[PDB]
Amino acid sequence: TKVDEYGAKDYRLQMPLKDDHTSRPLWVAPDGHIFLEAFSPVYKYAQDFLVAIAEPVCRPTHVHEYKLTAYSLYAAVSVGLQTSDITEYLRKLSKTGVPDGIMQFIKLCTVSYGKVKLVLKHNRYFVESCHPDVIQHLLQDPVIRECRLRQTVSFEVKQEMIEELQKRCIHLEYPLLAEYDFRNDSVNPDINIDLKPTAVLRPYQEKSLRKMFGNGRARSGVIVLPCGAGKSLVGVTAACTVRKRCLVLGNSAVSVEQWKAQFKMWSTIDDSQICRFTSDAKDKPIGCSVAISTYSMLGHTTKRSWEAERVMEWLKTQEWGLMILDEVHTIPAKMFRRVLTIVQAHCKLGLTATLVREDDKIVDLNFLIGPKLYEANWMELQNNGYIAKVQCAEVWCPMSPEFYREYVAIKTKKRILLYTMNPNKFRACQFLIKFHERRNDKIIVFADNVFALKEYAIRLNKPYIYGPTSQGERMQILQNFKHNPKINTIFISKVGDTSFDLPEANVLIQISSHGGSRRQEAQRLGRVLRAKKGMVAEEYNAFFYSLVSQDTQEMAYSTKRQRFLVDQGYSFKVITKLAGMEEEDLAFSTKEEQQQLLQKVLAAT
């Protein structure tokens, strides 16, 4: 609240300093931001404690950055951490005390939890609460009565209005409890699903699962994990532990296919007990319990097919023990978020790898599903070898003179097709691919602009893939890339970042970018994170290039596009010039060649 002569807020008169400050490696700002030391001998103990109560926002190598909020604190109580259980240790760990504002905030957040509990039974949602006083003063707003369908006091609530009420209670200072007591539940018989000994659970995976299962009752929340970290395995394990009906929801045809393979590979459950509620193909969804479906079909808004209609009615009627939603970052979408209310589930676990977006709808994920249970440390995984180390880089490609003139001259937005297609980046990518091609490194180019992607591919006569590409040709190209030594590069369009199972690649060039989308960058980055059989963290075998054009709008997006990655700890190095580019022969080595491309670019319209 107090501002120094500079921008920083003043806290000299706010909180004191512990005499043994050096022993205590923890800081506590009044705003809730916390700065831990990654060099302290007791760093690990602090890391576990802070992660339990706070959600990371920046975890560079030396000094991590944690901020706590109401959602973060509620999760701590769910795992059994009381206000004194956390504040006492926080004061002990704090090297500068705890400001009263945080103290009262912690007290208010912890006490305002568990008073209101939401339980669904017999397809009816009852807002149970041991304390009756909470309900008495909770019915002041008229929305509650109209929302409601027309000790331990409970009342049934309308199915459709659950989401509206859930967000209302969050700002009402009375969060709802979504814990599932699968251990004590006889209404829905347990499913015959078991985890085979073959599956191996990594220490972070166990910790993420442990945080989800704070007590005998499973907690509904979001577990963010890298795609190469094996987030699919964790989802399977959670379903196996619940031992009740689970409805995994994908986002595309590829997503549903992989999940079924993951279930069979890691779960002993029989093949016949798994169904694919997919329009393209089905396996008698009503017949068995464990099902894999997609947001589009379940949330499909237009006319429903007769066969789908029966399945949809069957899904609505039944009650699901678990509702795994992979790629939760798309949930707050209008159609996608409707699926939450359409189906009934006790705890709706959420998995993903890039929990970031521009529109401030990510915060809704806290109430749409639950608090962010776990968010693995990408840097720590790199040290442990679970994830391939990446030498993130940003190759600056100076714009050719003529190209800039039209780019600056025109105030229209043809520039997206212009600065994405310039000779220097073309030579840069052409040179960059050539260097990696002779190094036996697998390349995965990317480009939002299909027009640029096709032009780059034909000139480099490489197997470019994109949306309307035939499925058969899509598989044929991938198989050659994985197997054929003669080919070690595939030019994938945006479809690559959506969902796929691609072979591990040593490098990932990105000539163009869709825009300032932290999702796409992290989505595309996860492709090379696939750990190799016998690599090492320090070898930096995996690389990532995000080619950009200097003095162009592309730079603004690139800096705005790397915010999420740097927060994890990745350092994006800049490369003004590439050694050996001049000696190596490359296309567009003469003014005429650039002129024809510019004319074609201008003729694009």
Partner: peptide, 18 residues
């Protein structure tokens, strides 16, 4: 037959005392 996760949170920081 329950799993280790159902037992409870590890509480790694409880070991240290001051």
């Amino acid at each position: 037959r329950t799993k280790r996760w159902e037992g409870g949170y590890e509480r790694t920081w409880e070991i240290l005392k001051e």
